[PDB]
Amino acid sequence: SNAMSLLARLEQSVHENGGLIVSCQPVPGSPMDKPEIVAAMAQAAASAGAVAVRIEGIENLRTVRPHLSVPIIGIIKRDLTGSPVRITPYLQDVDALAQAGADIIAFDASFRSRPVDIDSLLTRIRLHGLLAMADCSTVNEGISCHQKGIEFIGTTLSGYTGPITPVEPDLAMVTQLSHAGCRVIAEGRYNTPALAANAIEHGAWAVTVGSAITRIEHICQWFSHAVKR
Amino acid sequence: NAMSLLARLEQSVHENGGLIVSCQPVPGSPMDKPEIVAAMAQAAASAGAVAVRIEGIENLRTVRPHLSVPIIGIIKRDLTGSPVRITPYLQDVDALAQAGADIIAFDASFRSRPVDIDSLLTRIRLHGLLAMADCSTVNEGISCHQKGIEFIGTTLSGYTGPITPVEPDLAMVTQLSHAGCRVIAEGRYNTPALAANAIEHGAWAVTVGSAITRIEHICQWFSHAVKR
Ligand SMILES: [Cl-]
Numbered sequence: 001s002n003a004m005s006l007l008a009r010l011e012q013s014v015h016e017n018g019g020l021i022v023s024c025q026p027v028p029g030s031p032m033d034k035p036e037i038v039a040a041m042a043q044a045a046a047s048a049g050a051v052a053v054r055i056e057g058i059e060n061l062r063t064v065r066p067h068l069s070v071p072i073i074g075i076i077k078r079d080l081t082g083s084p085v086r087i088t089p090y091l092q093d094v095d096a097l098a099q100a101g102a103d104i105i106a107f108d109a110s111f112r113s114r115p116v117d118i119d120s121l122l123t124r125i126r127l128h129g130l131l132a133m134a135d136c137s138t139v140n141e142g143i144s145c146h147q148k149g150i151e152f153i154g155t156t157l158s159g160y161t162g163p164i165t166p167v168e169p170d171l172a173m174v175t176q177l178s179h180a181g182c183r184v185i186a187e188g189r190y191n192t193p194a195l196a197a198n199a200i201e202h203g204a205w206a207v208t209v210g211s212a213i214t215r216i217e218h219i220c221q222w223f224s225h226a227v228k229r
Numbered sequence: 230n231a232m233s234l235l236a237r238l239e240q241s242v243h244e245n246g247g248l249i250v251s252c253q254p255v256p257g258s259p260m261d262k263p264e265i266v267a268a269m270a271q272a273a274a275s276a277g278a279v280a281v282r283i284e285g286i287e288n289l290r291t292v293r294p295h296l297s298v299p300i301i302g303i304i305k306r307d308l309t310g311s312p313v314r315i316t317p318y319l320q321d322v323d324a325l326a327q328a329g330a331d332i333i334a335f336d337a338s339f340r341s342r343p344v345d346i347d348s349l350l351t352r353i354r355l356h357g358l359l360a361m362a363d364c365s366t367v368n369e370g371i372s373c374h375q376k377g378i379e380f381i382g383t384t385l386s387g388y389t390g391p392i393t394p395v396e397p398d399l400a401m402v403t404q405l406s407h408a409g410c411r412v413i414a415e416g417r418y419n420t421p422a423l424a425a426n427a428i429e430h431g432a433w434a435v436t437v438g439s440a441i442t443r444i445e446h447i448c449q450w451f452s453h454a455v456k457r
Contacts, residue, residue: 044255047445226422
């Protein structure tokens with residue numbers, strides 16, 4: 001299938017080029033938050049080592065797609081009244097992402113109150129013949145998604161569903177999931193090359209880096225903080 | 230005037246910390262468009278940058294109207310027939326001034342060059358703008374300090390020979406700082422920890438470029454790390 005051949009080509013690409021995935025999500029409402037600029041970042045990253053990119057939003061994805069040759073992991077972020085889930089919560093979101101050219105669809109796979117169950121989101125992804133990525137927050141969530149046959153298990157939500165976000169990335173989750181057979185994408189707070197290397201060392205198949213590459217305001221804050229005395 | 234700008238900039242550095250962001254994407258990059266350079270400068274200014282460094286007239290004109298912080302302007306050349314690249318001509322000074330630069334930076338190295346350093350500085354002063362000396366050695370920085378140049382950068386240290394050191398030139402920061410220079414540490418300050426070190430070494434401010442505005446460079450650093 002096109003999905004299996006894409007996975008094979010991505011596995012080859014990670015093996016030959018290194019497992020770097022770049023999330024092209026500027027701060028929303030930022031000067032940088034324009035679809036053409038999102039497109040430019042994605043092209044720049046893909047020219048310089050990114051084996052794939054993550055893109056949020058239909059307008060961004062439609063602008064990016066025609067000018068990008070690597071796989072795109074697509075998400076939609078919503079804010080819901082009754083549920084804390086934001087990442088690709090609806091079947092309609094899956095449909096739109098598929099129609100706009102996502103190669104892989106990522107979605108919140110946490111054990112939290114939500115409008116559509118995980119199995120239904122996954123079925124809808126499979127209906128479009130696309131690969132699925134589970135954005136997880138705990139080992140148990142990751143294992144549960146692995147059991148369903150989901151191709152990519154992300155640590156994306158670890159630290160974003162509990163009481164506080166740790167400073168360091170969740171390397172223990174990477175370690176435990178990868179050694180349980182998951183194809184792990186380490187994601188969340190991998191904001192130095194050393195940390196990204198650390199994820200690979202702990203079993204991650206690839207690492208997604210976001211802020212350190214595509215959020216100028218955040219990078220500036222890091223430096224600004226360092227220089228004040 | 231120029232003194233009002235320096236005082237304002239002194240205040241902003243004290244209150245926010247001395248971070249200057251150089252907005253220079255890889256030439257030819259998808260990011261290398263004046264509207265994108267302008268967006269990067271605005272983004273940086275909203276998030277801690279007390280000033281930005283912009284290269285090129287097209288970029289500067291596009292950036293200027295939408296930016297409230299000072300702009301350090303340069304024009305980088307390849308074809309002067311000398312090793313000097315940073316703002317080598319009097320007409321470059323004229324064009325940067327006309328385009329809205331607040332501070333003009335220029336190569337202040339003791340190398341062959343079409344225009345002498347005194348003439349460039351005089352040209353900067355004629356436009357009533359502040360000057361910044363991009364220097365490669367302590368001796369170059371002291372010389373420019375004695376001319377009364379407001380900002381002394383370590384910008385060119387490691388960039389005049391075939392070998393570029395991995396670590397930033399922190400010794401040069403200390404030595405110039407001890408000589409009474411208002412030192413702008415510039416060159417290879419690509420981690421927050423290194424920027425902090427420059428301040429501890431006596432830097433007034435640190436200019437960061439690649440780690441903030443060169444996506445291809447940042448990607449390479451991460452790609453090299455994950456590769457194996
Ligand atoms: Cl030239």
